[PDB]
From a paper:
DARPins are engineered proteins that consist of 4–5 structurally similar repeats that stack on top of each other, forming a compact protein domain. DARPins combine all potential advantages of single domain binders over antibodies: they are small in size (ca. 18 kDa), possess high biophysical stability, have very high expression yields in E. coli, can easily be genetically encoded for in vivo applications and are devoid of disulphides and hence well suited for applications where they are expressed in the reducing cytoplasm. Structural investigations showed that these DARPins bind to different but slightly overlapping epitopes.
To connect 3G124nc and either YKKD or YRLK we chose flexible GS-linkers. Therefore, two linkers of 7 and 11 aa named GS7 (GGGSGGG) and GS11 (GGGSGGGSGGG) were tested for linking 3G124nc with either YKKD or YRLK. The resulting four constructs were named gc_K7, gc_K11, gc_R7 and gc_R11 according to whether they contained YKKD or YRLK and the linker used was 7 or 11 aa long. The complexes crystallized under various conditions with different unit cells and one to four complexes per asymmetric unit (AU). All GFP-clamps form 1:1 complexes with eGFP, in which the clamp indeed wraps around approximately half the eGFP molecule and creates a continuous large interaction surface, similar to the superposition of the two parental DARPins on GFP (Fig. 4(a,b and c)). The buried surface area (BSA) of the GFP-clamp complexes is 1625 ± 72 Å2. Between 7 and 11 hydrogen bonds were found in the different structures. Hydrogen bonds of Trp79 from the GFP-clamp to Leu44 of eGFP, Trp79 to Leu220, Gln81 to Lys41, His114 to Gln204, Asp143 to Gln204, Asn156 to Arg73 and Phe226/230 (numbering for constructs with different linker lengths, respectively) to Asn198 seem to be the most crucial ones, since they are found in almost all complex structures. The structures of the GFP-clamps confirm the intended design: both DARPin-derived domains overlay well with the parental DARPins when superimposed on eGFP. Most interactions between the DARPins and eGFP are found in the single DARPin complexes as well as in the GFP-clamp complexes, confirming that both domains can bind their respective epitope without strain or steric hindrance.
Numbering used by the authors:
A (entry chain A): 9 to 310
B (entry chain B): 1 to 64, 68 to 230
Write the structure that this text describes.
Amino acid sequence: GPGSDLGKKLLEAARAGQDDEVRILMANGADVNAADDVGVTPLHLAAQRGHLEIVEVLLKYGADVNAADLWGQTPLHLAATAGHLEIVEVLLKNGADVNARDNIGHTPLHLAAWAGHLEIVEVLLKYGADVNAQDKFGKTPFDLAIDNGNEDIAEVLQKAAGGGSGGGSGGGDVNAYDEVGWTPLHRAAWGHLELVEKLLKNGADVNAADIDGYTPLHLAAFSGHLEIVEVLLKYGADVNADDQAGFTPLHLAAIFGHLEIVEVLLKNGADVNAQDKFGKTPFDLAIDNGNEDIAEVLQKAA
Amino acid sequence: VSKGEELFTGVVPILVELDGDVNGHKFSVSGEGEGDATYGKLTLKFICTTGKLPVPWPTLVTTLVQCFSRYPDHMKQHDFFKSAMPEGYVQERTIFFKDDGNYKTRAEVKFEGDTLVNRIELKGIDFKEDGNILGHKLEYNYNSHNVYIMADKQKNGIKVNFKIRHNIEDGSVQLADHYQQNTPIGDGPVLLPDNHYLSTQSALSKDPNEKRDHMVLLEFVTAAGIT
């Protein structure tokens, strides 16, 4: 009753950054370790929303620096995600667990590298953050940095792992794959022509299939990138790859109306009689999707 | 800046209500929490308010708010989900469980005041009583997926396709094939995207202080595939 009412007001005041309210509520008996029904504490909210002075007063009066909500998040996770450098430093100075894991397995380093906060990455590393930590999906902070295009952070993290310079341009294995079976070439196939070329020159497996059976050529045909399709075929892509996919690249091109891709696939040996898992040929799908030019070409291809 | 977008610049409260019927077993689920599209992040907790859930919790994850996906700045013009807000969108799915029954769902996702609400009707049929779903043989965990998004210009909406992988307690995997379409509720113009994908990560957990049948869900989703 009275206490959880005060605790709730303190949660709201900490979230809102109301320093004077926080003082008054604490003086009137609001528990600094008040937690709502999902484990969120005033320190979580002050840290998340960037209210440094409140963070400091809560810690001064005994707030648990490593309190975890139901999702496994500590105040450091939230401050690292949000980019609040000074709060991150205050939390670490007060004994925050630098390698705490949220329920996905993210450490604060994962989240700061994901969200693009370089100075926080460096601070975490200086407080003992584990650069090799993997979350439950096998991702390191380096992987997440590169996944979100945070090249400067990726460069820093590779060096801290002992992998030398150059990490801003990707890891050391062109054929590394994640839990969905995606290689760098799968990622590049969505329009990054220069990277597709570089990866293939550096030994990328052109026919790698993901967990759903999709090769880079499928993804390039789905996303409509003619020049990438051409390059993949030039480096030996299987024009008729299916294998658990349940369709070929030619099926995708016929659905989405990519005439030049259809023609390139045919010129490279695509099979016009291939049936998807509903028994449809590319010609059937062009008809179904009202793609007249493509249907004509496929009907001419016999 | 844009209209629907601007509703998601910060933390948004979420309410989920699911009315279900699988092989005649009726149930209701309620969820609440918060989403922050800046990070593609959901923190939610769900309760089966009717009692014991008659299907495994992981099978309901996809049914239980893609407007919270992080669309990076260079892809803002491809974010159908937020562009339909606040009036929202209808999300319909058929989910085929390989060698088992199927779910059909219809949801309305929209703002009610300052809360984003997902209200769902689910019907499940043709499930085997000794299958992985009604037999509760699915592990309490969740995998990462790629969600494929295409415009349906003819219908002023999008089509979405993906395969969900459910780990089985014996070590196999139960495939749940998802066919999805979304259509705006309002008559205002929406964004119709070029083909792209979402990458998803989720973790399911339990609240040690919760006596009801329940699921704690942490979720991160990011859009990609446009250069």
